[PDB]
Design an enzyme around this catalytic site. Structure first.
Site, PDB file in Angstrom:
ATOM      1  N   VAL A 159       0.938  -1.297  -0.216  1.00  0.00           N
ATOM      2  CA  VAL A 159      -0.190  -0.037   0.045  1.00  0.00           C
ATOM      3  C   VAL A 159       1.240   1.553  -0.050  1.00  0.00           C
ATOM      4  O   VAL A 159       0.102   2.076  -0.988  1.00  0.00           O
ATOM      5  CB  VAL A 159      -0.916  -0.182   0.849  1.00  0.00           C
ATOM      6  N   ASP A 160       2.139   1.260   0.885  1.00  0.00           N
ATOM      7  CA  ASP A 160       2.782   2.760   1.376  1.00  0.00           C
ATOM      8  C   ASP A 160       3.578   2.449  -0.121  1.00  0.00           C
ATOM      9  O   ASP A 160       3.804   3.913  -1.137  1.00  0.00           O
ATOM     10  CB  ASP A 160       3.833   2.293   1.532  1.00  0.00           C
TER      11      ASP A 160
END
Lengths: 353, 350
Positions: free
Chosen positions: A162-163
Site C-alpha cells: 500500500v505504501d
C-alpha cells in the site's frame, strides 16, 4: 550531455516522512524535478531506522532542517513556499493547518502552488480522522481476505504494497495537477488516501459484493518443490495436457471446459499433481516455458535478485557504493534513474534558508 | 462542467484485460478522450465475466472501435487514426505491433506529437523477458509469495490482482510524465512499463535487504476475533491492556526485545485481549490515538462506514463500481457514462 527531463526546473517541497510520501518525491526527482525535503532538526525518523529505509526513496533530493513550532521557521517555510511549484505533505489532517503552513495559507500567498496531501484514511469525516501505517491500512481495507494461516491468524503481507502503490499514485496526481496548471492555469489541491489506493488494488474482488451479492491457474506440487502454472486458455490447456503426458484430460468429461475445470478443481489438482510427480519443478518450468506456457517458480526474495530476469531488466543502480532498486517507469528520451546520494539532514540550509 | 487536465487529448487504447484498461480509465477520469481498439467480436473481456467483471469498471467513458488488425484495411484505418492521437497504449507481445505495421517507429515517424506507451509482463529486454505473463505468474515470479506460511506448505498466492492495478497506475503515471515532457521540452517519448518491474518495486524494501550482502506491529488474538495493533504506543498499549509491563517483563523492554520474544510477546497480549471482544479492543485503542483495526474481509469492507465516508463507489447504467483513487479540488475525476458497446464509434473514427 544531460538530456532534458520532463520536470526540469520545477521545485517541490517535500514534507513527507517514511515511505509513501518520499516515494512520490523520488519519482519526481527521477523525472527531473528539484525536491527539497523539509525535515525536523536531526533529520527524518527514517534516516535513523535500521542503520536503510531512507536511502532508496531520497536520492537526489535537497534537505532543510526546520522546527515547525518556531515562527522563524514558519516564516522561512512561507518564503520557501512562494518559490515552490508543488508541496507534499503527509501529516495528519489539520496539523499542517495548525502549523500555519496549511493549504489555504500557502495558496493565498502563492496562487500558483499545487498542494498534495497524503493520508492514511482521508480527512473526510470522523472515521478517516485516524493515523495509519501500511500494515493497518492493508488489514482494514480487507487485504487479508481469503488467505488461511496454519494458526488461523490473518495473513499479513510482508511487503509494503500500500505504501509503495500509494507513492506512485501520489506521483500520478501531481503530474496530472502539473499538466492541469500548464494547460488550464489551475493550481489544484490533490488528495490521495492510502485506504483509497488499497481499495483500488482489490477492486475486482470488492466489486463482487457491491451489486446485491480460472483453472488451471495455481501453484502445484512436483517431485521437488512447487511450480506455478496458469494455463486455462483453450489452446493452452490442451498443450499443458499433452506436455504432462495426459491427453485424456484434454477432452475428458469434467475438465473439458473452463467452467467444469473451475468447478471441478480438487480433482484437477489431483490429476495434475499425479502427473507432475514425474519431474522437478525446475524441469517442468523449462519444459512449459519453451512451449509457450506461463509457468514459473515461486521465487523467494533472496532468489529473485539473483535471477537472470532481474539482471535483464536493469532494476538495480549503484549509488556512490550501495545498490538500490529503480522506479518502474522507463523512457527512451532520458533515464528516469539518478545516481546522486541522499542529502544529509539540513544540507541545503542557507541555500534556501 | 469545468476544465480537466487532459481535455483535448486523444489516446489509442489497444490494451486489454485490467492493467492497460485501468491506465486508460485513469486517463478518462482526467478528461482525455480514449478510444479503444478492439477485435471484431469485441474485447472478449466482456464475455469473460450478470455483470462483466474486469471489463465494465475500467472502460467507462471510453470509445470503442472494432477492427481486424491483420487486414490491410484496418492497418490503414489505424494509421489515419494514429495521426489524430496524442498517446497510444499497447499491451501486446513485445514484437506484435511492429509486425502489424503499427510499431513505434512506424506511428511516430508519421506523428511527431505521438507518445507511444508499451505495457508488458516482463519487459522484453531479452530471452528471459520473452515470455507471456499474467498477474499471478508475474506476482509469483517476482517473489510475492515469500514469508507467508500456508497450512498445506503450498506457496501463498495473493487472491487479488495487485500487480495488475499497481501497473495500471504506474502506466498512467508514465503517460502523464510523457505528456508533460512533450509539453515542456517538445519531445514525444516511448514509454515502457513492465509488470515485473512494478512488482519488484512494490517489494523494494524487502528486496533491498538481499541486494547488499555483508515491530511491534502485527495481528494478535482477542476474546473474539483478531486485532491488528500496530515508545508511547508501547506504554499506552500495556497501560490500556490492563497490564503494567513496559520494562516489567524486560523481554518487552526496548523495541528490539521482540527478537526471540516476539512469539512470547504475543501470548500475554493474547491472554490480555480475551478480556473483551475484539471490536471492543479496537474501540478502546482507537480512542487513545492507537493504530488498531479489524482484519476485515471484502464483504465486510463495502458495508463499513469508512468506505461510505470516502465516496469510493459510483453508480453506472445500474451497476456499482469503485472509482480511481486520486482526488482533485478543481474538478471531480469521475465519469458517470457507461462503457461503449463494441464498435460503437466505428462510424466516427474510421
Amino acid at each position: 550531455s544531460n538530456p532534458a527531463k520532463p520536470l526540469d526546473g520545477f521545485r517541490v517541497l517535500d514534507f513527507t516522512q517514511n515511505v509513501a510520501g518520499p516515494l512520490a518525491g523520488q519519482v519526481l526527482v527521477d523525472l527531473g524535478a528539484e525536491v527539497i525535503k523539509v525535515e525536523a532538526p536531526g533529520g527524518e525518523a527514517a534516516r535513523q531506522i535500521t542503520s536503510t529505509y531512507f536511502l532508496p526513496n531520497n536520492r537526489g533530493k535537497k534537505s532543510v532542517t526546520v522546527d515547525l513550532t518556531t515562527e522563524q521557521a514558519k516564516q522561512q517555510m512561507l518564503r520557501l513556499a512562494d518559490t515552490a511549484d508543488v508541496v507534499l505533505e503527509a501529516f495528519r489532517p489539520g496539523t499542517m493547518e495548525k502549523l500555519g503552513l496549511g493549504p489555504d495559507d500557502l495558496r493565498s500567498r502563492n496562487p500558483n502552488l499545487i498542494y498534495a496531501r497524503l493520508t492514511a484514511y482521508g480527512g473526510n469525516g470522523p472515521h478517516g480522522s485516524r493515523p495509519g501505517i501500511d500494515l493497518v491500512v492493508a488489514a482494514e481495507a480487507g487485504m487479508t481476505t481469503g488467505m488461511p494461516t496454519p494458526e488461523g491468524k490473518p495473513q499479513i503481507i510482508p511487503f509494503q504494497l500500500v505504501d509503495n502503490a500509494s507513492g506512485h499514485v501520489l506521483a500520478q496526481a501531481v503530474l496530472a495537477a502539473l499538466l492541469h496548471r500548464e494547460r488550464n492555469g489551475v493550481a489544484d489541491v490533490v488528495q490521495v488516501a492510502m485506504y483509497d489506493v488499497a481499495v483500488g488494488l482489490q477492486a475486482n474482488q470488492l466489486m463482487m459484493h457491491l451489486n446485491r451479492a480460472t483453472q488451471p491457474s495455481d501453484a502445484f506440487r512436483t517431485a521437488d518443490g512447487y511450480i506455478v502454472i496458469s494455463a486455462y486458455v483453450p489452446k493452452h490447456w490442451q498443450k499443458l495436457c499433452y506436455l504432462i503426458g495426459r491427453p485424456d484430460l484434454v477432452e475428458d468429461q469434467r475438465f473439458a471446459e473452463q467452467r467444469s475445470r473451475s468447478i471441478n478443481y480438487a480433482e484437477l489438482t489431483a490429476e495434475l499433481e499425479l502427473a507432475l510427480a514425474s519431474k522437478t519443478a525446475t524441469e517442468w518450468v523449462q519444459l512449459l516455458q519453451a512451449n509457450g506456457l506461463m509457468a514459473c517458480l515461486a521465487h523467494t526474495w533472496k532468489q529473485v535478485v539473483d535471477t537472470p530476469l532481474f539482471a535483464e531488466n536493469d532494476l538495480t543502480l549503484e549509488v556512490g557504493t550501495i545498490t538500490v532498486i529503480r522506479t518502474p517507469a522507463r523512457y527512451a528520451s532520458f533515464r528516469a534513474v539518478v545516481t546522486d546520494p541522499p542529502p544529509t539532514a539540513g544540507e541545503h540550509n542557507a541555500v534556501f534558508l
